[PDB]
Design an enzyme around this catalytic site. Structure first.
Site, mmCIF file in Angstrom:
data_model
loop_
_atom_site.group_PDB
_atom_site.id
_atom_site.type_symbol
_atom_site.label_atom_id
_atom_site.label_comp_id
_atom_site.label_asym_id
_atom_site.label_seq_id
_atom_site.Cartn_x
_atom_site.Cartn_y
_atom_site.Cartn_z
ATOM 1 N N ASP A 153 -4.126 4.457 -0.915
ATOM 2 C CA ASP A 153 -4.832 5.104 0.180
ATOM 3 C C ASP A 153 -4.819 6.593 -0.069
ATOM 4 O O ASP A 153 -3.759 7.195 -0.105
ATOM 5 C CB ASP A 153 -4.173 4.782 1.530
ATOM 6 C CG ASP A 153 -4.993 5.250 2.705
ATOM 7 O OD1 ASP A 153 -5.770 6.218 2.519
ATOM 8 O OD2 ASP A 153 -4.863 4.657 3.808
ATOM 9 N N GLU A 169 -8.472 3.428 -0.907
ATOM 10 C CA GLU A 169 -8.843 3.549 0.507
ATOM 11 C C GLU A 169 -9.181 4.987 0.901
ATOM 12 O O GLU A 169 -8.496 5.947 0.503
ATOM 13 C CB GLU A 169 -7.755 2.917 1.392
ATOM 14 C CG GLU A 169 -7.938 3.066 2.905
ATOM 15 C CD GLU A 169 -6.772 2.445 3.665
ATOM 16 O OE1 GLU A 169 -6.191 1.467 3.132
ATOM 17 O OE2 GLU A 169 -6.430 2.927 4.777
ATOM 18 N N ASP A 219 -10.231 -0.222 12.953
ATOM 19 C CA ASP A 219 -9.135 -0.088 13.888
ATOM 20 C C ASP A 219 -9.594 -0.608 15.245
ATOM 21 O O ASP A 219 -10.635 -0.189 15.757
ATOM 22 C CB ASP A 219 -8.747 1.373 13.987
ATOM 23 C CG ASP A 219 -7.507 1.582 14.829
ATOM 24 O OD1 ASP A 219 -7.451 1.006 15.935
ATOM 25 O OD2 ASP A 219 -6.601 2.318 14.385
ATOM 26 N N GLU A 243 -11.158 2.598 8.947
ATOM 27 C CA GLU A 243 -10.156 2.853 9.984
ATOM 28 C C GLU A 243 -10.590 3.944 10.960
ATOM 29 O O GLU A 243 -10.041 4.062 12.052
ATOM 30 C CB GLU A 243 -8.788 3.179 9.372
ATOM 31 C CG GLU A 243 -8.567 4.597 8.971
ATOM 32 C CD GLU A 243 -7.315 4.736 8.133
ATOM 33 O OE1 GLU A 243 -7.014 3.810 7.343
ATOM 34 O OE2 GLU A 243 -6.633 5.767 8.255
ATOM 35 N N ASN A 280 -6.252 8.677 1.926
ATOM 36 C CA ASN A 280 -6.401 9.361 3.208
ATOM 37 C C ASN A 280 -7.367 10.548 3.182
ATOM 38 O O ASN A 280 -7.006 11.670 3.545
ATOM 39 C CB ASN A 280 -5.044 9.775 3.766
ATOM 40 C CG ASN A 280 -4.279 8.595 4.322
ATOM 41 O OD1 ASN A 280 -3.383 8.073 3.665
ATOM 42 N ND2 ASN A 280 -4.669 8.127 5.511
ATOM 43 N N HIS A 329 -6.670 -2.326 10.549
ATOM 44 C CA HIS A 329 -5.877 -1.117 10.451
ATOM 45 C C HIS A 329 -4.922 -1.092 11.641
ATOM 46 O O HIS A 329 -5.359 -1.056 12.797
ATOM 47 C CB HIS A 329 -6.765 0.123 10.524
ATOM 48 C CG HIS A 329 -6.009 1.422 10.534
ATOM 49 N ND1 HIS A 329 -6.064 2.306 11.595
ATOM 50 C CD2 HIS A 329 -5.205 1.995 9.609
ATOM 51 C CE1 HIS A 329 -5.326 3.371 11.321
ATOM 52 N NE2 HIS A 329 -4.796 3.208 10.119
ATOM 53 N N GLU A 335 -2.892 -5.407 8.147
ATOM 54 C CA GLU A 335 -2.004 -4.336 7.751
ATOM 55 C C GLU A 335 -0.743 -4.361 8.597
ATOM 56 O O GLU A 335 -0.812 -4.427 9.825
ATOM 57 C CB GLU A 335 -2.651 -2.984 7.951
ATOM 58 C CG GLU A 335 -1.754 -1.857 7.528
ATOM 59 C CD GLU A 335 -2.418 -0.506 7.663
ATOM 60 O OE1 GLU A 335 -3.321 -0.390 8.518
ATOM 61 O OE2 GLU A 335 -2.043 0.440 6.927
ATOM 62 N N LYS A 371 0.830 -1.207 0.000
ATOM 63 C CA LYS A 371 0.000 0.000 0.000
ATOM 64 C C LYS A 371 0.856 1.245 0.000
ATOM 65 O O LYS A 371 1.847 1.342 0.724
ATOM 66 C CB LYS A 371 -0.921 0.033 1.221
ATOM 67 C CG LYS A 371 -2.108 1.018 1.114
ATOM 68 C CD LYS A 371 -3.207 0.732 2.159
ATOM 69 C CE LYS A 371 -2.947 1.427 3.499
ATOM 70 N NZ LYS A 371 -3.980 0.999 4.542
ATOM 71 N N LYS A 378 0.350 5.829 -0.473
ATOM 72 C CA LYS A 378 -0.588 6.943 -0.342
ATOM 73 C C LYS A 378 -0.611 7.811 -1.594
ATOM 74 O O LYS A 378 0.316 7.789 -2.401
ATOM 75 C CB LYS A 378 -0.233 7.821 0.860
ATOM 76 C CG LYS A 378 0.074 7.030 2.112
ATOM 77 C CD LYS A 378 0.028 7.861 3.391
ATOM 78 C CE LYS A 378 0.336 6.971 4.616
ATOM 79 N NZ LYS A 378 0.228 7.649 5.952
HETATM 80 O O1 LIG Z 1 -4.334 3.115 6.025
HETATM 81 C C1 LIG Z 1 -3.476 3.660 6.754
HETATM 82 O O2 LIG Z 1 -2.690 2.967 7.446
HETATM 83 C C2 LIG Z 1 -3.355 5.179 6.789
HETATM 84 O O3 LIG Z 1 -4.610 5.898 6.626
HETATM 85 C C3 LIG Z 1 -2.691 5.610 8.050
HETATM 86 C C4 LIG Z 1 -3.448 6.115 9.106
HETATM 87 C C5 LIG Z 1 -2.831 6.521 10.283
HETATM 88 C C6 LIG Z 1 -1.452 6.420 10.408
HETATM 89 C C7 LIG Z 1 -0.690 5.914 9.359
HETATM 90 C C8 LIG Z 1 -1.308 5.509 8.180
HETATM 91 MG MG LIG Z 2 -5.857 4.391 5.628
#
Ligand SMILES: O=C(O)[C@@H](O)c1ccccc1
Ligand SMILES: [Mg+2]
Ligand SMILES: O=C(O)[C@@H](O)c1ccccc1
Ligand SMILES: [Mg+2]
Lengths: 361, 361
Positions: B197, B223, B272, B249, B199, B299, B319, B166, B168
């Site tokens: 991702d 994502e 999460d 997440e 975000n 997550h 993850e 993955k 970003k």
């Molecule tokens: O999918 C993920 O891990 C990212 O959105 C993420 C979120 C929070 C901290 C690091 C990385």
């Molecule tokens: Mg994420």
């Protein structure tokens, strides 16, 4: 005209104040209200004020921390509430601004708007393009009893001129809810609006069952029959309910309202300025409620609510429950069951000896 | 058999640890991870452990306060995670448990389950009625570059045996996203799954536009294309998207997942453990995802995730992003691109000199 003021610092303190009137739930009275008081000093001789009601002392320190931490990163920044919101939004996108964080951000937004009004010698409502028209209000209680409480109720309706009363229920069985409501309607007659707040205490099938039974008493609304997060369960109650469903005191920011409205959760909403994102969020939601034709009321923070309701196209009721009186310079006034906004800014000033007396740390 | 253990106290501390590998976003590297470490002492010679990732140091003190305050009211109480959840739920119904509070409650739930496993000499997964089967995993990075990063990627796939990566995007324009993805696919060939991702960085129409362009690169998922609270906007992206949409997440507890699923927000979810309500919430959501036929990933919190994924009917990926290594006694191990749960309990022990070194207060 010369230049936009700028933030020079932010301060917050905890206090546990006595309530003008203790309100009693099923277990016991609550006579203490924990608050956080927020000051945003500017470079132009004005410090913005706002408070938050914090529900439980357990939240006092975290909220003080969060307000002060967030405020600190803002020093130097031009006092533009729209741009500041967008900044606080980017800043918490990953950690998330629901919860304590969200209250800190809304509190700051209120403080900002308050400064802007002061700096202009105006009440915020006039900043907002409206005027301080009086707003119909209602008086909020815990678990009322008709016999044991006739006294305080007579006062509210006759002296203060309240044409609407809210009580709580759900704590016990249906029998208790019904008796409590049968009493109240008998005692107050047909000309007083009665609202019933279940405070999230029921599940959807039980809510449906109780509401059917209570419909004969001409209730104005049933409030949060089920957990606030359960929007689909609210919609399901709402669909079967003969009585308007009210909710919203616990939802987060404009998006939180957008999803609730999309789900058809309630007939009425009542956002909390602490949770909807301050004045700036409120206004956003005001537009959503207008489009959805949803009568919009306020949840506590009566002093600032009075500034946004006059520009809320679907304005409904202002909730009166007074927590901040004992630490304000100018407690809230109800005249003939209505509240009128007080300037300048939000009309929030600290009674500093009052604060010093009650401050907790 | 003799008696159910009981809680005797709760402790939490802040640390800012170095990351095994700094991950770089568009602006800069993050090499520091702020954590909160939680201990729940019992009356039976076992202290339960769990940590939270706190996103920003600004959240460290509040979270410590909240964990310790909540823990304190629990001393004396029998160690029954289901009954304890229900208690923490009643306790925050009015203030609300989204946000920092929610993380405190989930953290405590993890600590509880961890104690229960220790007290039995078992990993939680076995408490949960399953076994520590290895779980396919993926390796999580910031903004990758194919040229500038070939080195670390070769390692992940060849030595650790990662079959999924993955990265970003969203920070810049579509051109950058596309080049970054064109590079990666060229470099890694067709046999590595690539996830992207965003975000929460885009809005629904922009997300739709970018996704159409990226579909030729065989992505495994997109994502959080838009803000996490915007469930209706996710559903709208999802409806038009040729690529599976992943999110979750940032959603709160089982109800938060129920409403997202009701809205059809995503094709995949990845709760999460800090935000879904610990092990106890996770399991609830596992059932929802099974009913909705939604592949469920995790997550972060890779160590505890490995204990619930083996009993998640729609288990997908674990993850891998390592924040807690430097303060654990037994960092996380990946073998042939899979993670296996480690007992007893959650397999979380503090490297106390490590902690002392990094602790912040
Ligand atoms: O999918 C993920 O891990 C990212 O959105 C993420 C979120 C929070 C901290 C690091 C990385
Ligand atoms: Mg994420
Ligand atoms: O509608 C209301 O005011 C109640 O839900 C309520 C909420 C929080 C504090 C007091 C009362
Ligand atoms: Mg209410």
């Amino acid at each position: 005209m010369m230049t936009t003021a700028a933030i020079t610092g932010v301060t917050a303190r905890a206090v546990i104040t006595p309530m003008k009137r203790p309100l009693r739930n099923a277990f016991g009275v609550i006579d203490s209200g924990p608050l956080v008081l927020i000051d945003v000093t500017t470079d132009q001789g004005v410090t913005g004020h706002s408070y938050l009601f914090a529900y439980t002392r357990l939240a006092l320190k975290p909220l003080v921390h969060l307000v002060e931490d967030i405020g600190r990163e803002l020093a130097g920044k031009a006092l533009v509430p729209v741009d500041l919101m967008k900044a606080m939004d980017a800043k918490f996108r990953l950690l998330g601004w629901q919860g304590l964080v969200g209250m800190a951000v809304s509190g700051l937004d209120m403080a900002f708007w308050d400064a802007l009004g002061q700096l202009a010698g105006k009440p915020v409502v006039e900043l907002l393009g409206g005027s301080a028209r009086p707003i119909p209000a209602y008086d909020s209680y815990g678990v009322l009893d008709a016999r044991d409480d006739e006294r305080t109720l007579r006062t509210a309706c006759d002296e203060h001129g309240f044409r609407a009363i809210k009580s709580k229920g759900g704590h016990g069985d249906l029998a208790t809810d019904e008796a409590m409501i049968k009493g109240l309607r008998a005692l107050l007659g047909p000309d007083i609006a009665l609202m019933l707040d279940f405070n999230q205490s029921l599940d959807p099938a039980e809510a449906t069952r109780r509401i059917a039974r209570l419909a004969d008493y001409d209730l104005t609304w049933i409030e949060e029959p089920v957990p606030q997060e359960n929007l689909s369960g609210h919609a399901a109650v709402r669909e079967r309910s003969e009585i308007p469903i009210q909710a919203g005191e616990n939802w987060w920011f404009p998006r939180g309202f957008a999803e609730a409205i999309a789900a058809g959760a309630s007939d009425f909403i009542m956002p909390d300025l602490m949770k909807v994102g301050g004045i700036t969020g409120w206004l956003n939601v005001a537009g959503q409620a207008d489009a959805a034709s949803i009568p919009m009321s306020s949840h506590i923070l009566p002093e600032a609510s009075a500034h946004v309701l006059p520009v809320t196209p679907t304005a409904h009721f202002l909730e009166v429950l007074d927590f901040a009186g004992a630490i304000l310079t100018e407690p809230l006034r109800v005249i003939d069951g209505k509240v009128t906004a007080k300037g300048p800014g939000l009309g929030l000033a600290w009674n500093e000896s009052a604060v010093a007396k009650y401050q907790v740390t």
